[PDB]
PDB file of C-alpha atoms (C1' of nucleotides) in Angstrom:
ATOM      1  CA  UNK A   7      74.023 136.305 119.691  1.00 39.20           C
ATOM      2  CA  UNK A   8      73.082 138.930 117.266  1.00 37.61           C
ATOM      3  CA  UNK A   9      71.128 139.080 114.057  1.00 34.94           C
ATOM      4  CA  UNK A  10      71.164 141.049 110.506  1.00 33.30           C
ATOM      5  CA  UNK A  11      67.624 141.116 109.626  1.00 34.17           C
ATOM      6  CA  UNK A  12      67.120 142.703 105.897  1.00 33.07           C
ATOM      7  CA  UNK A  13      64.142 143.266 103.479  1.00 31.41           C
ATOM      8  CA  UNK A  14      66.407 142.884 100.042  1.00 31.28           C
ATOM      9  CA  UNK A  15      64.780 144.076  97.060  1.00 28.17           C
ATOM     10  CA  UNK A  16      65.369 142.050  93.166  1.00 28.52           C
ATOM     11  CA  UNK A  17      66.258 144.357  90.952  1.00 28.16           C
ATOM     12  CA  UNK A  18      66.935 141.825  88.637  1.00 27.19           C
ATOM     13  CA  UNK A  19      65.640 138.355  88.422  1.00 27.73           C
ATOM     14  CA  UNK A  20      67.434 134.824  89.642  1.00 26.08           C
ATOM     15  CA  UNK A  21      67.457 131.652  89.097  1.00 28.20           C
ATOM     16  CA  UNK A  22      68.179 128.497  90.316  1.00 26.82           C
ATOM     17  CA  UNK A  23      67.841 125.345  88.434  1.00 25.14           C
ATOM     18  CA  UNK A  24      66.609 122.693  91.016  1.00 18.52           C
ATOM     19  CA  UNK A  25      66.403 118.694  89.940  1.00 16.76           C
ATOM     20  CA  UNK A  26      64.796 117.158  86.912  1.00 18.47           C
ATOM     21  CA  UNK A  27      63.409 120.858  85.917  1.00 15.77           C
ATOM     22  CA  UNK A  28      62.127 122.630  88.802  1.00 18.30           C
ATOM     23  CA  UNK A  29      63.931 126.176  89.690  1.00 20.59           C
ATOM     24  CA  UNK A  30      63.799 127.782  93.146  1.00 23.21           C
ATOM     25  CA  UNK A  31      60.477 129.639  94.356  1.00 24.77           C
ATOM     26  CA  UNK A  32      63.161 132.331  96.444  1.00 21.27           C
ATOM     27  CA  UNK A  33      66.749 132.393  96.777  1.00 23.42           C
ATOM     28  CA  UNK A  34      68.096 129.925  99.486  1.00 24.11           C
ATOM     29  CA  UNK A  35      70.873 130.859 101.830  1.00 27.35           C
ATOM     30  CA  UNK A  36      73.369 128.374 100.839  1.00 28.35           C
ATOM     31  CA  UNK A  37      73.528 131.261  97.504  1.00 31.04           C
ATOM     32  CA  UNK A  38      73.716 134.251 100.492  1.00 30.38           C
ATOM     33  CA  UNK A  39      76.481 132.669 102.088  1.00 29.32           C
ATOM     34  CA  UNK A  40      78.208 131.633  98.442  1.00 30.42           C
ATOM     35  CA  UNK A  41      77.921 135.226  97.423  1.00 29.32           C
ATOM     36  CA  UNK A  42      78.974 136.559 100.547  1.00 28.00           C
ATOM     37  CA  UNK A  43      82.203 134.367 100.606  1.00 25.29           C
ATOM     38  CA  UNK A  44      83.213 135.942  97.123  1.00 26.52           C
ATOM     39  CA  UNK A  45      82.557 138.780  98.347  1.00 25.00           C
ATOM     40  CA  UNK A  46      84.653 138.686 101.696  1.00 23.47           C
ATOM     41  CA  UNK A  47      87.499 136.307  99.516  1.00 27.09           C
ATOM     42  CA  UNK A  48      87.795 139.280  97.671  1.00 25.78           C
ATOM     43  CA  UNK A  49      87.490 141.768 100.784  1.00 26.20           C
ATOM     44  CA  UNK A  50      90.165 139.623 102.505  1.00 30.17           C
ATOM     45  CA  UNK A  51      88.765 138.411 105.461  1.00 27.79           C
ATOM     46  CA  UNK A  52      88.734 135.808 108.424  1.00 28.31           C
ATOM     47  CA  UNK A  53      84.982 135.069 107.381  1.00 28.72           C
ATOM     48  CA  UNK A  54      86.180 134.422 103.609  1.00 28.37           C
ATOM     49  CA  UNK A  55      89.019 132.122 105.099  1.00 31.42           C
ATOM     50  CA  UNK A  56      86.491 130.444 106.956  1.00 30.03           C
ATOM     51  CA  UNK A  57      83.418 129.775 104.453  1.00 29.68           C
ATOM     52  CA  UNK A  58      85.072 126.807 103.052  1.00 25.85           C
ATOM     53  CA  UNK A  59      83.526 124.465 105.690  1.00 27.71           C
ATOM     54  CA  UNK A  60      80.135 123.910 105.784  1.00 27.34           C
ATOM     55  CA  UNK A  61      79.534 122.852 109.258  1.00 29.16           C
ATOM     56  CA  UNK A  62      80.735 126.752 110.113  1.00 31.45           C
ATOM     57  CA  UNK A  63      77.955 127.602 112.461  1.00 30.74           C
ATOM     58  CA  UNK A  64      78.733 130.815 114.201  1.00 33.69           C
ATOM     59  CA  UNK A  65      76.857 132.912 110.884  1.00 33.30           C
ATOM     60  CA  UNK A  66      74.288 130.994 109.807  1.00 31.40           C
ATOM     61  CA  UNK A  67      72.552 132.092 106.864  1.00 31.80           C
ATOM     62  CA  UNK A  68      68.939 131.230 106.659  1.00 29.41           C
ATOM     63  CA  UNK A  69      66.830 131.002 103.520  1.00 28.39           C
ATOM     64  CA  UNK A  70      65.221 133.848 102.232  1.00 28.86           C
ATOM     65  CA  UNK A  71      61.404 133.408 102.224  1.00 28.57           C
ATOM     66  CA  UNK A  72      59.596 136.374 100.704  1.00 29.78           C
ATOM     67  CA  UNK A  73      57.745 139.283 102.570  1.00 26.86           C
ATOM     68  CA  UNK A  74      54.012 139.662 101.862  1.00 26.79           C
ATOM     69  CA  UNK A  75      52.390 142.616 101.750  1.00 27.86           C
ATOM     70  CA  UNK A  76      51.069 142.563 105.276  1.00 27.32           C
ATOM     71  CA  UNK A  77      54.587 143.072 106.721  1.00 30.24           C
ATOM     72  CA  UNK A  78      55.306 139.184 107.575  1.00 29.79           C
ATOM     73  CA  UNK A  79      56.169 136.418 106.437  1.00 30.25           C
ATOM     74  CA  UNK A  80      55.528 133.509 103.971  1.00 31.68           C
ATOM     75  CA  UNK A  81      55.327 129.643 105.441  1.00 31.42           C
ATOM     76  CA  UNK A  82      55.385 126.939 103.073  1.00 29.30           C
ATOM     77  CA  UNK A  83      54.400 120.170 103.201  1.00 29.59           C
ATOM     78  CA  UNK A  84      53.536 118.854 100.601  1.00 28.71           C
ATOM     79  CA  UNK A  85      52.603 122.532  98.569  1.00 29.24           C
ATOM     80  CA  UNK A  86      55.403 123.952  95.875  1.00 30.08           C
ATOM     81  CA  UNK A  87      54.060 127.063  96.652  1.00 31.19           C
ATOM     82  CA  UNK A  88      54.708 129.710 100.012  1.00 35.49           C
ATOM     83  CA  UNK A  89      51.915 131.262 102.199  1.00 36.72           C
ATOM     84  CA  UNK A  90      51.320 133.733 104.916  1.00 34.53           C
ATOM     85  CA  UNK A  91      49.386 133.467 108.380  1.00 32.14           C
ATOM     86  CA  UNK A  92      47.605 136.732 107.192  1.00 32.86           C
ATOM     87  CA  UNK A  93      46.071 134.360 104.550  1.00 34.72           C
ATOM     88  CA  UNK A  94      46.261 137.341 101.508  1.00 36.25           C
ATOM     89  CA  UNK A  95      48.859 135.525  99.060  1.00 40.12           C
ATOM     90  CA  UNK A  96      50.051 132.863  97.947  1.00 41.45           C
ATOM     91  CA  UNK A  97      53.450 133.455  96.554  1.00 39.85           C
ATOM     92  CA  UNK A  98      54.116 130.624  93.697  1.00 38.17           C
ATOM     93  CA  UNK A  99      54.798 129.406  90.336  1.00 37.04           C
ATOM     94  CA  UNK A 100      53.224 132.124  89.063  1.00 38.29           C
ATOM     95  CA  UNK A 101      56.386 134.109  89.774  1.00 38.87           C
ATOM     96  CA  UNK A 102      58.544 131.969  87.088  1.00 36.60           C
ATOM     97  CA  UNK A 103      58.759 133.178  84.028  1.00 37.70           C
ATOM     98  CA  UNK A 104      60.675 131.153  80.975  1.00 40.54           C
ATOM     99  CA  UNK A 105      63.227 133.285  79.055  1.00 40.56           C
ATOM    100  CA  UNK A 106      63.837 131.616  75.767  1.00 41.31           C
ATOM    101  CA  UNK A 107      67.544 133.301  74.954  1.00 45.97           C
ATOM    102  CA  UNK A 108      70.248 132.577  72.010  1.00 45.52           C
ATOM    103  CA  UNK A 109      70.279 128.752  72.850  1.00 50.87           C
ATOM    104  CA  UNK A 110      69.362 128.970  76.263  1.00 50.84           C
ATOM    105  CA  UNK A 111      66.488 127.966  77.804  1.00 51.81           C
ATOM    106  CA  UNK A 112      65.851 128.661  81.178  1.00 50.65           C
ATOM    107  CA  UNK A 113      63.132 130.045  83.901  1.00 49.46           C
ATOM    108  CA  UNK A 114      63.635 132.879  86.424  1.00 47.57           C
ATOM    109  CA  UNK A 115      61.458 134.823  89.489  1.00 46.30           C
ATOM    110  CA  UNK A 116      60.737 137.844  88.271  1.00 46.20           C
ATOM    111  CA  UNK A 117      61.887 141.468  90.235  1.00 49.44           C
ATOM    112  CA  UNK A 118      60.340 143.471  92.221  1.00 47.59           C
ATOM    113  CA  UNK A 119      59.639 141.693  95.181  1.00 45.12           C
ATOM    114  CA  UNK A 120      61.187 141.839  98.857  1.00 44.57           C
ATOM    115  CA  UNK A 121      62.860 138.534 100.642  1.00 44.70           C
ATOM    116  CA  UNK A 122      64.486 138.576 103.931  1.00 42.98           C
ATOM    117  CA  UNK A 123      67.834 138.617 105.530  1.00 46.78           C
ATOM    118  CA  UNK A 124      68.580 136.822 108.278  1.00 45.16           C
ATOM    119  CA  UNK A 125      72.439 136.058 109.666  1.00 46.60           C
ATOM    120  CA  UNK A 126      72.039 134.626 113.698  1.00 46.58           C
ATOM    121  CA  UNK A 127      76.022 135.704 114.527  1.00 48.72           C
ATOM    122  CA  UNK A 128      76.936 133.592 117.790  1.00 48.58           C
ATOM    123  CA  UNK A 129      79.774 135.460 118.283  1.00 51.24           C
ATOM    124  CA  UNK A 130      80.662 138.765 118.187  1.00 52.77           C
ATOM    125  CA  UNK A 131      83.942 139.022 116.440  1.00 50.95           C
ATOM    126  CA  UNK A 132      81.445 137.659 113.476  1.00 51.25           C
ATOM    127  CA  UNK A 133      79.485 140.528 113.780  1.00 52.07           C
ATOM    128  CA  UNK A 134      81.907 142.912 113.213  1.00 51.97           C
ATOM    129  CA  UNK A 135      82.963 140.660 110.148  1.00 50.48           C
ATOM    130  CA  UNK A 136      79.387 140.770 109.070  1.00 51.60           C
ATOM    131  CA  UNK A 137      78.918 144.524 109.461  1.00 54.11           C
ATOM    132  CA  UNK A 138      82.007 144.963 107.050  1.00 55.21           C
ATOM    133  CA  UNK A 139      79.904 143.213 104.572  1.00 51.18           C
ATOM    134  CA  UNK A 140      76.806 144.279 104.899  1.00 50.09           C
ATOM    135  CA  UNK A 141      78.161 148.089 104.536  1.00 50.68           C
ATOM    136  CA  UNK A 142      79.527 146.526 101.471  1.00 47.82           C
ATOM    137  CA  UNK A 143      76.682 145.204  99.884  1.00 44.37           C
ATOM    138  CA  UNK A 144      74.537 148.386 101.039  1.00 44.97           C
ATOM    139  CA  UNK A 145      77.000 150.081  98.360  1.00 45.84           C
ATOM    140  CA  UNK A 146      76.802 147.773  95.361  1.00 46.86           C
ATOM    141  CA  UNK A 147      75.124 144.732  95.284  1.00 46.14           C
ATOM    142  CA  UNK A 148      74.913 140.795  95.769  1.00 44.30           C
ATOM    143  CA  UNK A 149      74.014 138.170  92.909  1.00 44.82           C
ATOM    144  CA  UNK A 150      71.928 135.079  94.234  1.00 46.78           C
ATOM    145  CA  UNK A 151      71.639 132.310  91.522  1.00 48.36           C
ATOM    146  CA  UNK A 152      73.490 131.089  88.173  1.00 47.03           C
ATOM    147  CA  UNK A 153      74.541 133.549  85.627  1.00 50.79           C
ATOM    148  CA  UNK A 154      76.031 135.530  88.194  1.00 48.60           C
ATOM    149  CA  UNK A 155      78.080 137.460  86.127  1.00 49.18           C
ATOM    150  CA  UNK A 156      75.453 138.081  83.063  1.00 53.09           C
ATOM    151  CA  UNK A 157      73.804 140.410  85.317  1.00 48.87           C
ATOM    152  CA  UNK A 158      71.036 137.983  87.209  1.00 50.79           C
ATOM    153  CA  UNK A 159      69.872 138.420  90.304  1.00 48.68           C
ATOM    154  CA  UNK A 160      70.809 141.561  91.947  1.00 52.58           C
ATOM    155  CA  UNK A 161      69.441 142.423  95.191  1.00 54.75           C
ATOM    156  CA  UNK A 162      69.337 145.654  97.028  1.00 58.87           C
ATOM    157  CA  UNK A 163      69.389 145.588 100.731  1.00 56.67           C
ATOM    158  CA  UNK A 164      66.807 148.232 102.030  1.00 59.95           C
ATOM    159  CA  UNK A 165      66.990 147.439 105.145  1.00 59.53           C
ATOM    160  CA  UNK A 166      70.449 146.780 107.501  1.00 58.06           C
ATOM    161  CA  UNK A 167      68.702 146.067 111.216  1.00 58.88           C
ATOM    162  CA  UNK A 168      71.203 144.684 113.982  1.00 59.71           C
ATOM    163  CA  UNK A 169      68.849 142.957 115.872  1.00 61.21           C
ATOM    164  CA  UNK A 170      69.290 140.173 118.914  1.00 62.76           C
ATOM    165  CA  UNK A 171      68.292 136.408 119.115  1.00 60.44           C
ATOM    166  CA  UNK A 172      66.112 134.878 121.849  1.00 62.03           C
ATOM    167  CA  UNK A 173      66.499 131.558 120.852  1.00 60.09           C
ATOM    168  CA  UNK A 174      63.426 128.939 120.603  1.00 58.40           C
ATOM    169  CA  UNK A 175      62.082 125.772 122.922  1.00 56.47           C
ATOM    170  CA  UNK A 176      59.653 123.543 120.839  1.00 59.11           C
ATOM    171  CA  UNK A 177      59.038 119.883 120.276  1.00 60.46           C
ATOM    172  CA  UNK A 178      58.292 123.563 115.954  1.00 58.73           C
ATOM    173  CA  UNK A 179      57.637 124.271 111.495  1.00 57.79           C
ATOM    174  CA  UNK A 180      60.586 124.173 109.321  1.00 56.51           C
ATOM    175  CA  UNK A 181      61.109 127.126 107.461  1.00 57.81           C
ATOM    176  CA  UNK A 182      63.621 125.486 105.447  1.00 59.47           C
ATOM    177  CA  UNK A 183      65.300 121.726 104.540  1.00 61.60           C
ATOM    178  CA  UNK A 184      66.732 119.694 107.241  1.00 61.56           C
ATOM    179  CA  UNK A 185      68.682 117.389 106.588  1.00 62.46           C
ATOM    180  CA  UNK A 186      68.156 114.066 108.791  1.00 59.48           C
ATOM    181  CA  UNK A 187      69.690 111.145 107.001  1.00 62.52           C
ATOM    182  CA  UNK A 188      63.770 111.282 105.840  1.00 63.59           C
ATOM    183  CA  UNK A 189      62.981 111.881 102.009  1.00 64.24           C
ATOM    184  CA  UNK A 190      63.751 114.944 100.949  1.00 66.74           C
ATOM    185  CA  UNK A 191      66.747 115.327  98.041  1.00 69.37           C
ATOM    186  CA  UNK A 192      68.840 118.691  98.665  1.00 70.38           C
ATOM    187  CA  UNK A 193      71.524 119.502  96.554  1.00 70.73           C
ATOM    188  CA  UNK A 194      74.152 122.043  96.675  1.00 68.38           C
ATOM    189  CA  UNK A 195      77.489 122.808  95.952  1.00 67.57           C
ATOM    190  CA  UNK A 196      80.751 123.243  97.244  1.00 65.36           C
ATOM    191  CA  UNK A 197      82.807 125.236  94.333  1.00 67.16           C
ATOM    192  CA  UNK A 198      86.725 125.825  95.709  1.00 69.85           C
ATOM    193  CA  UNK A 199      88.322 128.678  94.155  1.00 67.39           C
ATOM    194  CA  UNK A 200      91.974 128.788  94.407  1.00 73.31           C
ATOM    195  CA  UNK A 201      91.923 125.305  94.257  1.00 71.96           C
ATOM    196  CA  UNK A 202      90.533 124.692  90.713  1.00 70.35           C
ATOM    197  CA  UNK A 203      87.769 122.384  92.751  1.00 69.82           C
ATOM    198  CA  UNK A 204      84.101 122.439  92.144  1.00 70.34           C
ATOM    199  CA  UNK A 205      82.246 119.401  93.343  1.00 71.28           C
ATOM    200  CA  UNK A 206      77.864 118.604  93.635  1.00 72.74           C
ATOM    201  CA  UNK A 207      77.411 117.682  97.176  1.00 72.62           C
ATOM    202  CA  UNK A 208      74.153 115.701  97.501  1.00 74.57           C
ATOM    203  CA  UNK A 209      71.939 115.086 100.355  1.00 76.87           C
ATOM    204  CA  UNK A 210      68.694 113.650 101.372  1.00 76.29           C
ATOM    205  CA  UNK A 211      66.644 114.801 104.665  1.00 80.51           C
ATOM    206  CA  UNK A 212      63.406 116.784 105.416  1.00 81.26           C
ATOM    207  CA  UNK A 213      60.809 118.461 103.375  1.00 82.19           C
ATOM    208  CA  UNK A 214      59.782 122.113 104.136  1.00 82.30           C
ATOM    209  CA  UNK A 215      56.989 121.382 108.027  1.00 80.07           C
ATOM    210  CA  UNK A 216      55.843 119.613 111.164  1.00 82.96           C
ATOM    211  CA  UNK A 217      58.669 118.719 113.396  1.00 82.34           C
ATOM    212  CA  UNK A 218      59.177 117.678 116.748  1.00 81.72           C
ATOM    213  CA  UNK A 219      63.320 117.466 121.472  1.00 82.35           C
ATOM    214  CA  UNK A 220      67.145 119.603 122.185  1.00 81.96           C
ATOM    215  CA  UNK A 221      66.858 121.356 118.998  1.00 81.89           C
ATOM    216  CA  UNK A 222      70.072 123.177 119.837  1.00 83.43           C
ATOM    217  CA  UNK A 223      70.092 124.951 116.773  1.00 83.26           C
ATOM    218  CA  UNK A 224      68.276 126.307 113.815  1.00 85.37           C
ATOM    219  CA  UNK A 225      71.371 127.350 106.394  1.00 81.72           C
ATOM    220  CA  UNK A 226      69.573 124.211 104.823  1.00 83.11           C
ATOM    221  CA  UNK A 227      67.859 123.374 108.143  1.00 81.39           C
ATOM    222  CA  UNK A 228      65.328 125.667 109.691  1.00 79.35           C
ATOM    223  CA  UNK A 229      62.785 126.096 111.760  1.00 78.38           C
ATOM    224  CA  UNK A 230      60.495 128.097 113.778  1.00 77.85           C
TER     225      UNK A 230
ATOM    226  C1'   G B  29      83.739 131.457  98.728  1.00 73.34           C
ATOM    227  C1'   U B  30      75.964 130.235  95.258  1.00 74.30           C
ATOM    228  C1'   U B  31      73.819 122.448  91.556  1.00 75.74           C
ATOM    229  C1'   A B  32      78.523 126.688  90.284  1.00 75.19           C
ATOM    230  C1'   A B  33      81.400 128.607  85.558  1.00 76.27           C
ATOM    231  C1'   A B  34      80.402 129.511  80.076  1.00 78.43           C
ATOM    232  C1'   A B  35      76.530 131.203  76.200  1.00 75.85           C
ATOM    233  C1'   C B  36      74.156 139.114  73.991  1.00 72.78           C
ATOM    234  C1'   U B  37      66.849 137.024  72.141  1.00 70.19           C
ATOM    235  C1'   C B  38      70.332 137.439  67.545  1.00 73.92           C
ATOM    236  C1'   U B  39      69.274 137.786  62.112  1.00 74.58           C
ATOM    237  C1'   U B  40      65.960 139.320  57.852  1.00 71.20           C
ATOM    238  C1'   C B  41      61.777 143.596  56.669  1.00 70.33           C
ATOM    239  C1'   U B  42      62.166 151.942  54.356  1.00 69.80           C
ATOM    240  C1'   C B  43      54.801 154.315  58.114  1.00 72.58           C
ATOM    241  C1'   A B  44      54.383 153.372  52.901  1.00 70.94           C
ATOM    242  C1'   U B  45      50.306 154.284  49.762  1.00 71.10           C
ATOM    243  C1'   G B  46      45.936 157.765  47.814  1.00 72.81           C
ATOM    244  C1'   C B  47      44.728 163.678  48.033  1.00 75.00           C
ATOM    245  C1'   U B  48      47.285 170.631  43.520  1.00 74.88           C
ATOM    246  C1'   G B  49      46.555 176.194  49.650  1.00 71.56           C
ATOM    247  C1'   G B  50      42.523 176.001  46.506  1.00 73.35           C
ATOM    248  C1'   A B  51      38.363 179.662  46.424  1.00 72.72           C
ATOM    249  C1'   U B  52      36.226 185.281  46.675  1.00 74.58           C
ATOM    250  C1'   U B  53      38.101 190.664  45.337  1.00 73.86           C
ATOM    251  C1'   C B  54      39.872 195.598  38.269  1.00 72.42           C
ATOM    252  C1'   G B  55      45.941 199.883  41.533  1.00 72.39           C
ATOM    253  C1'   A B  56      41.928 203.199  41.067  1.00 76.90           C
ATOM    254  C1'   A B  57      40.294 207.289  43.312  1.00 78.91           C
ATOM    255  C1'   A B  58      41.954 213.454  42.400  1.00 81.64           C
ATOM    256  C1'   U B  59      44.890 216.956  38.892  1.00 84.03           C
ATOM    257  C1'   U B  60      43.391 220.688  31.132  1.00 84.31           C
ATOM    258  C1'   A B  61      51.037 220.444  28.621  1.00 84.69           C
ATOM    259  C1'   G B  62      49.352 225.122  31.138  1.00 82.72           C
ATOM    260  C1'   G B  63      51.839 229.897  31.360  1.00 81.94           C
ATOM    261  C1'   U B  64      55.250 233.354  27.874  1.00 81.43           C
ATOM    262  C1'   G B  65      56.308 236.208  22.274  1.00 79.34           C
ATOM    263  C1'   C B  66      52.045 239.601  16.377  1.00 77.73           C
TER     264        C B  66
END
RNA sequence: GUUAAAACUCUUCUCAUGCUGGAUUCGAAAUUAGGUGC
């Protein structure tokens, strides 16, 4: 039980176009592991042949929540808006920015800012897997949101650290959306190439917060 | 294999107008068409 902890640098900005007109705050890792399957469908892979399932724990790609600038990291209920337990920002709306193109309107984060990586590999033939790609994107580059192939949303990882998991006992703050049949809507997607298949997989569950007994787990749901 | 995928912030618009490198200062300072032969 290995990790692949990353500080991943915009270069350019992302997007992602949440309900009735909200857009993401940080990119999510349901877009790390979408990017990451293109990228190991077109690397020809076990880990490509396997991303079609979403119950596929094993890799488990958790959100990617923002670093501050006092080395840690933000915590978001109830607040469309992240913070830190250092107390110096409060990472936000501010960060959108509306880009009025041809006919397009739209809103993005802007670039420049550093957002974590974070893969907990059970096993270890899915490390290997996931060192192939992470000396792949190290070389080029991975595209988290829509307009994928304008140009939006490239990140550079600065950072490839193999660390280890010690695994966590509470009865604990989610870090991301879980997704217990309470009130939270999550939506996502589950586009099939080489099947001509793209279909919007709803859901409803928990908002990102306090949570209480096995936990024998925890990339929509999070927590630590 | 990312609420995916698709859509260029594009078109139109001359740093242009006004303002003279002008003003001061003499090519002059020195030197016998001289020497020879009714």
């Amino acid at each position: 039980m290995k990790e692949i902890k990353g500080i991943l640098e915009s270069i350019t900005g992302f997007s992602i176009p949440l309900d009735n007109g909200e857009y993401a705050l940080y990119p999510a890792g349901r877009h790390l592991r979408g990017a990451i399957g293109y990228i190991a469908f077109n690397l020809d892979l076990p880990i490509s042949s396997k991303f079609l399932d979403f119950d596929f724990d094993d890799i488990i790609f958790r959100d990617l929540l923002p670093i501050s600038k006092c080395g840690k990291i933000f915590y978001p209920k109830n607040s469309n808006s992240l913070k830190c337990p250092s107390c110096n920002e409060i990472y936000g709306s501010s960060v959108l920015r509306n880009i009025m193109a041809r006919g397009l309107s739209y809103k993005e984060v802007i670039e420049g800012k550093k957002y974590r990586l974070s893969i907990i590999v059970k096993d270890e033939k899915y490390l290997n897997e996931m060192e192939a790609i992470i000396r792949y994107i190290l070389s080029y580059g991975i595209y988290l949101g829509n307009k994928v192939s304008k140009g939006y949303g490239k990140f550079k990882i600065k950072e490839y650290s193999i660390v280890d998991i010690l695994p966590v006992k509470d009865s604990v703050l989610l870090l991301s959306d879980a997704i217990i049949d309470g009130e939270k809507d999550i939506v996502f997607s589950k586009k099939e190439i080489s099947s001509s298949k793209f279909e919007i997989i709803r859901k409803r569950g928990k908002a990102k917060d306090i949570i209480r007994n096995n936990h024998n787990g925890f990339g929509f749901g999070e927590i630590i």
